[PDB]
Amino acid sequence: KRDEALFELIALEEKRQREGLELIASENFVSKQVREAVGSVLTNKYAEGYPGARYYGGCEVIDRVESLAIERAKALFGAAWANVQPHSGSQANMAVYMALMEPGDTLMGMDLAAGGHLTHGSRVNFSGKLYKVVSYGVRPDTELIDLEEVRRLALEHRPKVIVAGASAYPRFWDFKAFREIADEVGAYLVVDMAHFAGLVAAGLHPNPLPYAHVVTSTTHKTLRGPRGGLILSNDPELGKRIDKLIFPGIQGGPLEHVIAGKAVAFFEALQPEFKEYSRLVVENAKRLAEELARRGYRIVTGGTDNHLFLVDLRPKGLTGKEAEERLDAVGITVNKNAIPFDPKPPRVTSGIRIGTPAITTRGFTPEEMPLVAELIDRALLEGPSEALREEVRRLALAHPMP
Amino acid sequence: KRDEALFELIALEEKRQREGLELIASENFVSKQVREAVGSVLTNKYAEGYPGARYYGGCEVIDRVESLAIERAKALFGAAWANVQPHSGSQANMAVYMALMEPGDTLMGMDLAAGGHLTHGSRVNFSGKLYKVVSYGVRPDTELIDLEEVRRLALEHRPKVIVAGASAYPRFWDFKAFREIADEVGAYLVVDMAHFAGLVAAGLHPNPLPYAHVVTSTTHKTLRGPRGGLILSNDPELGKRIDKLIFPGIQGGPLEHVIAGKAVAFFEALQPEFKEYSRLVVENAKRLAEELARRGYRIVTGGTDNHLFLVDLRPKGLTGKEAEERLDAVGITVNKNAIPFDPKPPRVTSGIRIGTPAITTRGFTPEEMPLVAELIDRALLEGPSEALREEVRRLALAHPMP
Numbered sequence: 001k002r003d004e005a006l007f008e009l010i011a012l013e014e015k016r017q018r019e020g021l022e023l024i025a026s027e028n029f030v031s032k033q034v035r036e037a038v039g040s041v042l043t044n045k046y047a048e049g050y051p052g053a054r055y056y057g058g059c060e061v062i063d064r065v066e067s068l069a070i071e072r073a074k075a076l077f078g079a080a081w082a083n084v085q086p087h088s089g090s091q092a093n094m095a096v097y098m099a100l101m102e103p104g105d106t107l108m109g110m111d112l113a114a115g116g117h118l119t120h121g122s123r124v125n126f127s128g129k130l131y132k133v134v135s136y137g138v139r140p141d142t143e144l145i146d147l148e149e150v151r152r153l154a155l156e157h158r159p160k161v162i163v164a165g166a167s168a169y170p171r172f173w174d175f176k177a178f179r180e181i182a183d184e185v186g187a188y189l190v191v192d193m194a195h196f197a198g199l200v201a202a203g204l205h206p207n208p209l210p211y212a213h214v215v216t217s218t219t220h221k222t223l224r225g226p227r228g229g230l231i232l233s234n235d236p237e238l239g240k241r242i243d244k245l246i247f248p249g250i251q252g253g254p255l256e257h258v259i260a261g262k263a264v265a266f267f268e269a270l271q272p273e274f275k276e277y278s279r280l281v282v283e284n285a286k287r288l289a290e291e292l293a294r295r296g297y298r299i300v301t302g303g304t305d306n307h308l309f310l311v312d313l314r315p316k317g318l319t320g321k322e323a324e325e326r327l328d329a330v331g332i333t334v335n336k337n338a339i340p341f342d343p344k345p346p347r348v349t350s351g352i353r354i355g356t357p358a359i360t361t362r363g364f365t366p367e368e369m370p371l372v373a374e375l376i377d378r379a380l381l382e383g384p385s386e387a388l389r390e391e392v393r394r395l396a397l398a399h400p401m402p
Numbered sequence: 403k404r405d406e407a408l409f410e411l412i413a414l415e416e417k418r419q420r421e422g423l424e425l426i427a428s429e430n431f432v433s434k435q436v437r438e439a440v441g442s443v444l445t446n447k448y449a450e451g452y453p454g455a456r457y458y459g460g461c462e463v464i465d466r467v468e469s470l471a472i473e474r475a476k477a478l479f480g481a482a483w484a485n486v487q488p489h490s491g492s493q494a495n496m497a498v499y500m501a502l503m504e505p506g507d508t509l510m511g512m513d514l515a516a517g518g519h520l521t522h523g524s525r526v527n528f529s530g531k532l533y534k535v536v537s538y539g540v541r542p543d544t545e546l547i548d549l550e551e552v553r554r555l556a557l558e559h560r561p562k563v564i565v566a567g568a569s570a571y572p573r574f575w576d577f578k579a580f581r582e583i584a585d586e587v588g589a590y591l592v593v594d595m596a597h598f599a600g601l602v603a604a605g606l607h608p609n610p611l612p613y614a615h616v617v618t619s620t621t622h623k624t625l626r627g628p629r630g631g632l633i634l635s636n637d638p639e640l641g642k643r644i645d646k647l648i649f650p651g652i653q654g655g656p657l658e659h660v661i662a663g664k665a666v667a668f669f670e671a672l673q674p675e676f677k678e679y680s681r682l683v684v685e686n687a688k689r690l691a692e693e694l695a696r697r698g699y700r701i702v703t704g705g706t707d708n709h710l711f712l713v714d715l716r717p718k719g720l721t722g723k724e725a726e727e728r729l730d731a732v733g734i735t736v737n738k739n740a741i742p743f744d745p746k747p748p749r750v751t752s753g754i755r756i757g758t759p760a761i762t763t764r765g766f767t768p769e770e771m772p773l774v775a776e777l778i779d780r781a782l783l784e785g786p787s788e789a790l791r792e793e794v795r796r797l798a799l800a801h802p803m804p
């Protein structure tokens with residue numbers, strides 16, 4: 001018997017994805033071959049351990065798959081060591097923190113309200129439960145990280161680990177300065193590149209590998225791979241320590257079908273086509289930010305260096321929650337996001353976050369960003385209408401999904 | 403461009419799975435429709451939070467998928483609450499421990515050599531690093547759990563959490579007695595049913611749900627679903643606590659394509675055909691253990707009540723590592739496994755673990771277990787030969803599976 005109730009929902013989700021504009025910055029659409037690998041029989045194999053050093057028979061082919069994912073990751077990112085087993089970006093961070101720190105040690109990371117991730121020290125996350133947390137944010141007058149304040153905080157608190165990277169920070173990172181600061185206090189520098197890993201792979205974002213002691217990431221988001229995690233380093237001895245925390249430390253059997261999907265995603269990113277895709281992501285984001293500024297919004301930090309930007313909605317008197325709702329009503333998905341020193345509480349906010357990776361995967365190009373900006377503005381100014389929902393639906397449908 | 407090299411490896415793994423006898427007790431073969439759900443576009447959507455309580459818009463269909471998995475898990479096991487987001491059995495156990503304990507509390511679980519899982523308190527695992535561990539074993543004479551020793555250990559050490567369930571214990575569990583022992587010291591009883599979850603669902607193993615405070619599980623062993631984790635409870639208020647530890651506590655975005663696969667697996671397990679499948683799993687395991695005993699192999703406890711058994715290879719002068727290699731040389735896949743009171747460490751061991759869920763899925767019957775026992779025996783006694791490898795290959799190819 002086919003599970004028809006479940007597959008009816010999958011068909012509805014396929015239709016939903018085709019018929020709207022996905023502007024949430026973390027999203028992307030994986031290729032059919034990434035899906036083919038993830039849906040493979042490799043899920044059937046228990047393969048605890050590492051290639052050639054497994055706790056089960058029968059892993060000869062799985063070992064070739066996992067080694068292929070590892071070697072491609074090292075080639076793609078210019079790394080000396082990789083671990084491709086983390087089930088998610090959160091598990092990548094967890095293994096690294098547990099390899100470098102004991103509970104009670106001090107972790108330094110970007111404040112959630114300023115753009116940091118839950119795993120960078122939030123009190124409701126294991127990162128802020130197991131470790132003492134020092135957070136850094138952005139300057140009120142620049143909207144940017146203040147390296148002098150990062151350094152001041154690190155000297156005062158002597159973190160064991162400093163995390164650079166974020167989920168909602170629209171500019172480049174000074175990885176060299178972060179490593180200088182970590183060196184001054186004897187901390188490890190961990191770079192969580194999840195959001196911008198595709199741009200690093202494409203050479204369109206500074207590469208953190210030479211400066212970080214360890215780099216963590218998601219394989220999804222701008223890298224456009226299957227949902228899962230990744231760890232990289234230029235230090236294979238540190239790598240051996242982290243391998244032990246992934247297994248037997250915090251995971252059991254790895255998802256070898258997902259690892260096969262990671263090998264496919266790395267294959268795709270090693271092709272020259274991926275650099276052009278990534279160039280268009282960055283150009284779409286800059287252009288869309290510019291076109292919204294021309295229509296009367298303000299862009300936090302004035303713009304963006306990467307795939308995402310933050311819209312300050314105060315020129316038009318809207319909250320992030322209101323804007324989210326109005327845009328959802330016409331099939332445009334964004335997410336509310338606090339602006340620096342936001343005057344509104346976090347369930348409300350004064351901003352939204354937009355990213356271009358997903359629409360760029362569907363073939364949107366920079367000359368189409370004025371129209372996207374116009375439709376966003378109309379939704380915000382006019383509120384929802386059937387006509388605007390259908391214009392968005394036609395536009396989405398005209399940009400086929402992988 | 404298609405990633406031909408990676409897909410050639412997948413084809414080699416498909417061929418390996420067709421042409422050998424997969425006797426690893428923790429493995430199975432998922433159906434084509436479980437694969438189809440896990441390969442779906444649902445990977446593309448970030449769905450942090452829970453159904454009807456998401457961070458982001460656009461989850462209206464995802465919520466119906468996750469809710470379907472939740473409600474089918476509740477119906478399958480008679481639970482009042484379920485969490486279907488854990489990425490793995492390891493993450494299901496981690497979240498439960500962090501919901502019920504603080505680092506430094508006492509955790510009581512089964513000794514690893516006696517059958518307990520790494521996440522039941524191993525010092526190289528988060529369970530033995532974050533918590534103070536005390537372990538119960540089995541009796542040296544019968545190799546069975548002695549509930550009176552379990553009771554003494556609990557009274558002496560006053561654990562906050564007692565774990566019942568195991569990776570390699572071949573007999574039934576007295577969950578009522580474990581709960582009485584937990585109540586005597588005010589401990590929470592956590593049952594990790596990962597190995598026997600399918601047998602519970604089929605009514606062929608005592609159900610822990612009435613007696614445990616919390617039940618954890620994998621979806622991919624006897625449940626024959628996608629690779630992932632699961633949490634259940636008959637207390638929906640305890641469930642709300644644990645939901646917070648899965649997210650935002652230890653995970654980020656859930657794998658909604660895998661969750662769709664879990665829904666499919668639970669649908670398959672609710673079918674009458676699954677009860678007959680599970681009956682044959684247990685009959686095959688009992689018969690195969692009896693057939694090897696009649697060839698002179700020592701079976702730990704003399705037999706099995708479930709899908710797995712352990713062979714003590716000390717009388718044959720072989721380590722489990724050597725047995726695993728010899729069997730794999732002729733296409734019979736097992737894993738070396740610790741046995742109770744094992745003098746050798748986990749990378750060597752004195753035994754092998756065999757289970758029947760995977761071959762039973764391919765249609766192996768109890769009347770074929772005499773032939774499987776013969777092939778295992780010859781592999782250990784004579785070592786490898788192409789004629790023996792081909793005999794194994796023919797028997798495997800007689801049992802096709804899409």
Ligand SMILES: Nc1nc2c(c(=O)[nH]1)N(C=O)[C@@H](CNc1ccc(C(=O)N[C@@H](CCC(=O)O)C(=O)O)cc1)CN2
Pocket residue numbers: 048055248252514515516517518519520521524526569570737738739740747748749750
């Ligand atoms: N009873 C039981 N059997 C099981 C497991 C289990 O947890 N318990 N496994 C659960 O997955 C599998 C084997 N996995 C294991 C992997 C590593 C270690 C371990 O203790 N490793 C140590 C020391 C190794 C050595 O020196 O031999 C380490 O890595 O430091 C144990 C089991 C299958 N059989």
Ligand SMILES: Cc1ncc(COP(=O)(O)O)c(/C=N/[C@@H](CO)C(=O)O)c1O
Pocket residue numbers: 046048251252253428490491492493495519521567568569594595596597620630631
């Ligand atoms: C009782 C129990 N709980 C949790 C897990 C952990 O499940 P993930 O592997 O993280 O999905 C397992 C796994 N067992 C494997 C070896 O780990 C095996 O037996 O062969 C288990 O047996």
